[PDB]
Amino acid sequence: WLVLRDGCMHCDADGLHSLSYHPALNAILAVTSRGTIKVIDGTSGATLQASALSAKPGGQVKCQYISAVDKVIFVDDYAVGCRKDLNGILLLDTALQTPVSKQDDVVQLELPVTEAQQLLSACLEKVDISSTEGYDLFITQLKDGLKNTSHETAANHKVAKWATVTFHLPHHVLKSIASAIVNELKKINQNVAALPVASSVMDRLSYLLPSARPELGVGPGRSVDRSLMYSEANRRETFTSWPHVGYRWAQPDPMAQAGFYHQPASSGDDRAMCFTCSVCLVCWEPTDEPWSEHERHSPNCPFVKGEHTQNVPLSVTLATSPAQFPCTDGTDRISCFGSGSCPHFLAAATKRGKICIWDVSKLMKVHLKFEINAYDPAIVQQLILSGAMEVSLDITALSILQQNIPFPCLLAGGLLTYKSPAPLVRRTLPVLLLYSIKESDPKPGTLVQCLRLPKFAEEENLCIDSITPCADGIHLLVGLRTCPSGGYLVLYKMNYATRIVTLEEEPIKIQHIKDPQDTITSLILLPPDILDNREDDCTLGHLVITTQGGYVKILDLSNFEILAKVEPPKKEGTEEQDTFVSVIYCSGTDRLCACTKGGELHFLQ
């Protein structure tokens, strides 16, 4: 494993609080406190993107690279961005675009090259619609962007690919253009490739306004308007009591992906009815795969041939769910949160007071509205059983980690911020509070057994910046941070031997290093067959610590044994420390990233 020096180049010196990567379109998602994007080529130095797209600057662009399934969930200061488009592509330039409050807001459409060029074709090459309102302004914007790129087109077209036109046109022009295109494409019912584009634009126009959003027509014997169907969500929402789920290949998700709608009724239990020609079919069967059956009874469906005409797959169908604003003020601070490596559970901890979790498998619906009593005796009972005053609950983060009487409870801790004088002595103790996930058909949320942090861990009041389960999934790794050799750590075991889930009754070992000054700020855990050559030739992971002096220490977490030491390099031209600040595991590259505040890069072969 040779190591060589090649060179360095400034990449990012704007500061970093969280790290992420974008593996879909090979355009690195930059996490910045402002939202600006800067990309510089290293080998040739050619510019790939020259555009400062900022619809509403000042928002924290926080996205986390979930490498379990290689998906990134972008989160802004307002809502949660589940950008699941066709083939699961993501958006980079919309890092500062937020849901609108009025029609006066500035929106950055920033469509990719595909749909932007499709609009260009439908406006000049395919169809000529120059007589509509706002056509001149949009064409002028597109040609202005093209002319701006034309100077850099002599090198590459990626400038036009990413330095897109600032599509901040007023919503009235876009509304008029969308209405004209939809009318033209629906009066003759022509299924050209521009039909999905027109449908998507009209869907945005009719859904992004909560005031103009109609209701859902759910219920037998009730009619549904034909205008809202340009999204498949209406069809997918009717699969409430489908009784053929127990079929072999008629699983809920694949069958709903096909694009049918079923009214719950005793008649027509397995009756089939599609949309292409409204043919009355029968005999839904376990071996009757929905896509295969759709091709069998309707080969003219555009899904069969792959044409882009009224194509709304499951990802596009379920990626149009609306969002609601939790609070108008949000006076509660934002300190630390994360989603972990568990994409199945959506973890966007809104520490503003209200946290609602919607299951990905099921459809989004209104669930519950309530207010919390300020005199709950459960916490006081827990405190008293361990051994003037106003106690209130502030919901900060919900975390679900996994490998009745009592009710199933989970080690979900919250950041209690209450100050007491230190006759009383100020002490902080984590607590576990859970709501009623589902009735087990007593009082829901009864704690089974709580795991207490070690004495030294509570002594320094370390806060869990993030939670990351171990690779094997048996043991739990807890992240720690310190606000401005190992340190203070936690080590316990959970029992998974009995048929019913239980918990261990005795700690095994507690790691207490008498060196709190150099507490680990961040760390990663890797299987025993990645890092070391001996390990490669051969489950708790590998513990590598970083020192302020720049020395690199390689230790094996299995035995806490020091393996090798590497001296820090020397900065060129200046004596300032060339420290590595970025450390994150990217499944796209599988390398240990290292970006410096001074603007230098190094590669470890």
Task: Tell me the DSSP string of 170-202.
Answer: -HHHHHHHHHHHHHHHHHS----THHHHHHHHH
Question: 358: how many CB neighbours lie within 10 A of its CB?
Answer: 12
CA distance 312 to 321: 14
**Is 301 annotated to bind ligand?**
yes
* Token pair belonging to 42: 């290293």
Q: How many residues does the chain have?
A: 605
| Region class of 379: left (phi > 0), else alpha (psi between -120 and 50), else beta | alpha
Residues after which the chain has a gap (C–N > 2.5 Å): 387, 403, 422, 441, 484, 538
Amino acid identity, residue 317?
T
Three-state secondary structure call for residue 432: strand
Q: With contact defined as beta carbons under 8 Å apart, do 551 and 568 qualify?
A: yes
Phi, psi of 194 (to 5 degrees): -80, -10
DSSP 8-state secondary structure symbol assigned to residue 280: E
CA distance 136 to 400: 52
Q: With contact defined as beta carbons under 8 Å apart, do 56 and 97 qualify?
A: yes
CA distances in angstroms from 279 to 93, 273, 288, 341, 464, listed in the order given: 44, 6, 17, 45, 58
Q: Is 62 exposed, middle or buried (0-12, 13-18, 19+ CB in 10 A)?
A: buried
Specify the resolution in Å. 3.0
Question: 313: how many CB neighbours lie within 10 A of its CB?
Answer: 17
Please name every residue paired with 543 in a beta bridge, in sequence order, or none if there are none.
Answer: 555
Q: Estimate the crossing angle of helix 113-120 against helix 194-207, to 10 degrees.
A: 110
Q: With contact defined as beta carbons under 8 Å apart, do 489 and 476 qualify?
A: no
CA distance 43 to 171: 42
* Token pair belonging to 224: 């549904």
Sign of the C-alpha dihedral, residues 194, 195, 196, 197? positive
CA distance 407 to 447: 7
Phi, psi of 478 (to 5 degrees): -115, 125
CA distance 271 to 283: 6
Q: With contact defined as beta carbons under 8 Å apart, do 81 and 129 qualify?
A: no
CA distance 476 to 410: 13
Three-state secondary structure call for residue 137: helix
Three-state secondary structure call for residue 379: helix
CA distance 126 to 122: 5
* Token pair belonging to 274: 């599609």
DSSP 8-state secondary structure symbol assigned to residue 86: G
Cβ neighbors of 47 (< 8 A, separation 6 or more) are: 40, 41, 152, 155, 159
Strands, sheet with 71-75, edge to edge from the N-terminal-most edge strand: 62-66, 71-75, 80-81
Which of 229, 111, 195 is CA-nearest to residue 161? 111
> To which H or E segment does residue 65 belong?
strand 62-66
**Is 538 annotated to bind ligand?**
no
Amino acid identity, residue 463?
C
CA distance 14 to 35: 11
CA distance 17 to 407: 37
CA distance 288 to 254: 12
> To which H or E segment does residue 564 belong?
strand 561-566
CA distances in angstroms from 153 to 41, 138, 160, 163, 235, listed in the order given: 16, 21, 8, 12, 45
Q: With contact defined as beta carbons under 8 Å apart, do 228 and 206 qualify?
A: yes
* Token pair belonging to 154: 């002599």
* Token pair belonging to 11: 């990449």
Please name every residue paired with 546 in a beta bridge, in sequence order, or none if there are none.
Answer: 552
- Give 21's Cβ-side CA count (13 Å radius): 17
Q: With contact defined as beta carbons under 8 Å apart, do 181 and 194 qualify?
A: yes
CA distances in angstroms from 141 to 55, 103, 135, 247, 456, listed in the order given: 16, 20, 10, 53, 61
CA dihedral 478, 479, 483, 488 (to 10 degrees): 60
Greatest Cα pair distance, the chain, in angstroms, is 84
DSSP 8-state secondary structure symbol assigned to residue 302: H
Please name every residue paired with 45 in a beta bridge, in sequence order, or none if there are none.
Answer: none
CA distance 512 to 490: 9
* Token pair belonging to 328: 């108008």
Q: Which residues of 277-293 are buried (b: 16+ CB within 10 A; e: fewer)?
A: eeeeeeebeeebbbbeb
Phi, psi of 129 (to 5 degrees): -120, 35
